[PDB]
C-alpha cells in the first residue's frame, strides 16, 4: 500500500 504515495519514513 505504502508504495502508492510518496513521503517520509514512518
Amino acid at each position, epitope marked *: 500500500g505504502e*508504495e*502508492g*504515495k*510518496r*513521503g517520509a*519514513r*514512518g
Partner: antibody
Amino acid sequence: QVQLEESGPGLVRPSETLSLSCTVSGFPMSESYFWGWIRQSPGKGLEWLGSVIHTGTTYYRPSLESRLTIAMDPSKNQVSLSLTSVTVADSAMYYCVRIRGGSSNWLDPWGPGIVVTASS
Amino acid sequence: QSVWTQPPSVSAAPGQKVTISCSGDDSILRSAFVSWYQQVPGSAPKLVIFDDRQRPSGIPARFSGSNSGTTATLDIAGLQRGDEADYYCAAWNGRLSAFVFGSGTKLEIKR
C-alpha cells in the same frame, strides 16, 4: 529492463505551454512505481518537478504546482509533462524518470534528457 | 531546506577514497531514505545508492552510503578515472512535502 525517452520541442515561446512526452518501454506502468520529471538548468542543479502513479495520485514541486500537469497513459506507455505560462527561467534539460515511491523515493532509470529553451 | 547542502568539490587520486556529505536542517534526513546520483558531464544522472546504503545491481561495492540523520554520506573508494562526475544526493522533505536534491559535488580525479 526499463527504457525511457523524452520527446517534444527544443524551443518554446514565453507564455506558451511546454508539452513533453516520455515513452516507457520494457516495464509495466501498472506496477507500483511513480513516473516523473526532473530538470536541470545549464551549469546548475537538479530540480524535481513532479510525478504520477497509475492510480492517479500526483505530486508537484510547490512553486510550480499552478502551472504543471504530469499525467500518464498506460495504453500508450507514456508519461507527459505540461507546463503552462513558460518563462525564460524554464529553459533546462528535462529528464523522464521512473520513481520508486513510498518512503524510498529513488529514481532509476533516467531518460537521456531533452534540451528545452524558452525564448522569443 | 529546499536544497540539501553538499560541498562544491572533492579531489583525489586513483585508488584513493572520498566522502561526500549531504545535510538538511537539524535531523530532517533521519525521516527520509537518501539516494545518490552520478552525473558524468553530458549524460543523465545514474542511481548509485538508494535507501541510504543499498546498491543497485551492477553498481560496484566501492560506492557506499550512510545516513546519520543529520547528514548523509556517499563514500567512493578505489577511485577510477571514469568516476569523474557530479554527485547529487536526494531525499523527500516531509516539511515541504517535496522531493529535494542536494546542491551537487564535482569529483576531480587527480593526475
